[PDB]
Amino acid sequence: GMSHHWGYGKHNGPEHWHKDFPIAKGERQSPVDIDTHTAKYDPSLKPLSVSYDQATSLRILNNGHAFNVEFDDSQDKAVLKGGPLDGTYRLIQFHFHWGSLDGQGSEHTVDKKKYAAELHLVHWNTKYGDFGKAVQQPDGLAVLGIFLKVGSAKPGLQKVVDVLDSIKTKGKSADFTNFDPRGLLPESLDYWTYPGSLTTPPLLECVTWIVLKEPISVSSEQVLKFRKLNFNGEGEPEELMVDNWRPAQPLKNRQIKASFK
Numbered sequence: 001g002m003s004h005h006w007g008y009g010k011h012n013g014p015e016h017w018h019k020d021f022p023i024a025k026g027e028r029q030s031p032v033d034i035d036t037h038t039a040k041y042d043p044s045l046k047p048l049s050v051s052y053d054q055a056t057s058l059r060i061l062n063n064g065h066a067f068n069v070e071f072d073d074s075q076d077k078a079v080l081k082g083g084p085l086d087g088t089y090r091l092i093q094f095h096f097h098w099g100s101l102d103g104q105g106s107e108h109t110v111d112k113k114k115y116a117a118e119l120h121l122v123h124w125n126t127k128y129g130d131f132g133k134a135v136q137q138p139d140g141l142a143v144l145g146i147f148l149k150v151g152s153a154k155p156g157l158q159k160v161v162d163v164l165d166s167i168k169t170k171g172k173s174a175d176f177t178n179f180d181p182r183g184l185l186p187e188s189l190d191y192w193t194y195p196g197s198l199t200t201p202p203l204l205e206c207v208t209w210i211v212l213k214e215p216i217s218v219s220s221e222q223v224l225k226f227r228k229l230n231f232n233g234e235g236e237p238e239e240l241m242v243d244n245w246r247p248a249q250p251l252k253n254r255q256i257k258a259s260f261k
């Protein structure tokens with residue numbers, strides 16, 4: 001990706017991606033709007049199994065598009081199973097998409113409603129051996145999406161907020177061990193699920209999306225810090241990292257299933 005020039009600006013944003021990544025106009029692109037009245041309850045959907053007790057976080061990185069908290073995925077330490085999934089999916093990293101204003105920022109929307117931000121916990125199907133192989137498969141990834149609304153602070157998110165000062169610009173990283181991702185989950189695991197894609201280039205259609213119905217609340221101060229990050233690298237003109245979200249894409253020939261009535 002040494003030649004990738006896509007971003008979220010007026011000249012390289014979502015409306016431009018299809019030129020370098022034609023799959024942008026594909027048949028199972030993400031995100032999508034979740035029409036709650038049209039999603040159908042699927043009683044055959046098993047409860048989701050989130051096992052993060054042995055999670056091993058390693059580093060946090062500002063990659064110029066968002067910041068990723070990375071985990072050791074060389075063993076089954078933090079995995080997602082159940083729900084619409086068959087097999088074991090390992091957590092490799094999580095990141096967020098957020099806006100410049102509290103009224104926007106999420107990628108998925110619920111009945112057209114936009115949340116302040118959206119957390120993506122990325123997992124890959126272990127039957128494919130490694131993440132690189134997994135993204136080339138229709139069932140290679142499982143991304144657990146969680147909406148963030150502004151209200152009370154999320155205690156479990158503060159460690160992330162406090163380290164952002166050290167990775168302000170593109171390419172900067174910092175040790176980030178012993179972070180417990182369980183502190184970012186809502187109480188309920190009720191969810192909607194549909195087959196989709198990565199929401200940023202290469203936009204590969206390798207994701208089973210699992211979006212939780214219950215958002216978590218974060219404080220205005222917490223999301224404000226997210227907005228102080230930079231898309232640019234150090235020593236370059238400052239461009240605040242905000243509105244790094246892709247808008248809802250056509251649902252086309254897909255049905256969103258709900259795990260609850």
Ligand SMILES: C[C@@H](Sc1nc(-c2ccc(Cl)cc2)c(C#N)c(=O)[nH]1)C(=O)Nc1ccc(S(N)(=O)=O)cc1
Nearest residue numbers: 120122131132133135143197198199200201202207
């Ligand atoms: C790095 C890219 S795709 C990719 N990633 C990798 C890769 C594999 C492992 C690591 Cl540590 C880093 C990169 C390889 C390899 N090897 C590869 O061939 N392709 C990626 O993972 N982007 C990505 C992830 C989630 C989402 S989202 N918003 O849908 O959750 C969007 C884009």
Ligand SMILES: [Zn+2]
Nearest residue numbers: 095097120199
């Ligand atoms: Zn994402």
